[PDB]
């Protein structure tokens, strides 16, 4: 219930800091990180025997309401 005891993160308990300043009047921030993970298959056996990682495809989107300036 209280901030000092809740177990979960919420929109009201987080600040988004860019270049040492807080972002004002954001609406959402969402981040996708995909490793391109792929299994290694084989003749004679239908299932893959390990996964390997390809490219660190890492992104964050920021959506914000336009501050009158700044």
């Amino acid at each position: 219930a209280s901030e000092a005891k809740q177990t979960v993160h919420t929109g009201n308990t987080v600040l988004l800091m860019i270049k040492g300043k807080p972002v004002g009047r954001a609406q959402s921030a969402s981040g996708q990180r995909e490793y391109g993970t792929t299994g290694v298959y084989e003749i004679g056996s239908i299932m893959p025997q390990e996964h390997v990682y390809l490219r660190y495809e890492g992104t964050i989107t920021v959506e914000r309401l336009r501050m009158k300036k700044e």
Binding site: Y41, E42, I43, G44, S45, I46
Partner: protein
């Protein structure tokens, strides 16, 4: 597939006297009505198995046609031979 490879290997290897005195391969097209006598082409029996479809074999066969299966061998045809070919 292994039986096929072994038939083909045995037919190719025994032909080391220029040409088999016996039969060429006899082919029946049970799908569209047609029949041929055939010989292994110089491409041969190419066998492969890629990553895609791991548990399925694929085979590639190329042949050359000697003649229709309806017609008997050229040299084996019984000529007229009337009179006597072996005069005393």
């Amino acid at each position: 597939m292994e039986e096929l490879q072994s038939r083909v290997s045995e037919y190719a290897m025994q032909g080391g006297s220029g040409n088999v005195s016996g039969s060429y391969l006899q082919f029946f097209n049970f799908t569209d009505d047609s029949y041929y006598k055939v010989h292994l082409a110089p491409q041969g029996l190419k066998i492969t198995r890629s990553k895609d479809e791991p548990l399925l074999f694929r085979y590639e066969i190329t042949l050359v046609v000697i003649g229709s299966l309806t017609e008997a061998d050229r040299s084996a045809v019984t000529t007229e031979e009337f009179g006597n070919v072996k005069p005393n």
